[PDB]
From a paper:
The vitamin D receptor ([name]), a member of the nuclear receptor (NR) superfamily, orchestrates calcium homeostasis and bone mineralization through transcriptional control of [name] target genes in various tissues. [name] is a ligand-dependent transcription factor that forms an obligate heterodimer with retinoid X receptor α (RXRα). Helices 3, 5, and 12 of the structured LBD serve as the ligand-dependent activation function 2 (AF2) surface for complementary binding of co-regulator proteins (e.g., the p160 family of steroid receptor co-activators such as SRC1). Agonist binding in the hydrophobic pocket of LBD facilitates AF2 to adopt a conformational rearrangement that facilitates high affinity docking of co-regulatory proteins possessing conserved helical nuclear receptor box (NR box) motifs (5′—LXXLL—3′) that dock into the AF2 surface.
Here we present the co-crystal structure of the [name] LBD-[name] complex at a 2.2 Å resolution. The [name] LBD displays the canonical α-helical sandwich similar to that observed in most NRs, and in this structure Cmpd3 assumes a curve shaped conformation accommodating the hydrophobic ligand binding pocket (LBP). The 5-amino tetrazole amide moiety of Cmpd3 occupies the 1,25D3 A-ring region of the [name] LBP, hydrogen bonding directly with Ser237 (H3) and through water to Tyr143 (H1) and Ser278 (Loop5). Consistent with the crystal structure data, peptides that contain these residues all displayed strong protection to solvent exchange in the corresponding [name] studies. All compounds (Cmpd1–3 and 1,25D3) occupy a similar overall orientation and binding location in within the LBD. Despite being a weaker binder, interaction with this non-calcemic ligand afforded a similar extent of protection at [name] H12 compared to that of 1,25D3.
Numbering used by the authors: 122 to 164, 216 to 423
The structure:
Amino acid sequence: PKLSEEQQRIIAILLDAHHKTYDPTYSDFCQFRPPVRVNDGGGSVTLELLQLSMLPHLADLVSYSIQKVIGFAKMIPGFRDLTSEDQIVLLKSSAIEVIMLRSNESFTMDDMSWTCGNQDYKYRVSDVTKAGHSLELIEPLIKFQVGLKKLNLHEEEHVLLMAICIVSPDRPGVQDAALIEAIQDRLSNTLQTYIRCRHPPPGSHLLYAKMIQKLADLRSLNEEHSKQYRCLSFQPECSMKLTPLVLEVFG
Ligand SMILES: CCC(CC)(c1ccc(OC[C@@H](O)C(C)(C)C)c(C)c1)c1cc(C)c(C(=O)Nc2nnn[nH]2)s1
């Protein structure tokens, strides 16, 4: 097969959008409220909810990340042709899934952590539980990160996957499903063609089907995250540890 001029333009736009919305040096992380790691009885749920020591830092990180996702989405070919109602629905419903995809670049299989520079910005299972989450979310999240890392995606495939994730016509509340489907089909066809033309074997074997499966896995992680966020919101005064953007997107 062959990538058309339009498909190559779409790829060039998305790579550029990524380069403009992802900092591989994590230079802004020092501006977030500082990470706090204290004694909590070996990860006791009770003391983790009493302290929520990692919540202001990780809420700042997710809020920064939603801002970058918004910036990326604005550059997706066709996204600005949608109504403001469809843009909000797509952005709110995909935000945590795109964050999970984005975070894979800093994820390392050496020690199963997200290494964003200094050991202060090295995140593990323990840090997520220190923000109030339980193993029902962080165990399959780690499983997803490893699974995605083993795909060894080209940057072109990585940007196309995040773009396909955002522009999903099957999100609850979407009005113009037909226009969203036409945008995603253009992106999905660009991806299938890219894999056939540029991805060499063995890595290319059933890669499109594996990428689509990661999108289904992301929906299940989104529902679990949404359940965990509701339980965290029952904790008195925890909203003051969040941000207006995080409260709007997840509330
Ligand atoms: C995806 C995993 C992880 C692990 C620390 C994460 C953070 C907060 C989390 O929960 C907190 C939320 O539930 C609240 C309550 C809404 C705040 C959860 C469940 C996971 C992130 C790691 C990195 C590097 C991320 C990021 O954003 N990477 C980026 N962005 N830009 N450049 N690098 S996110």
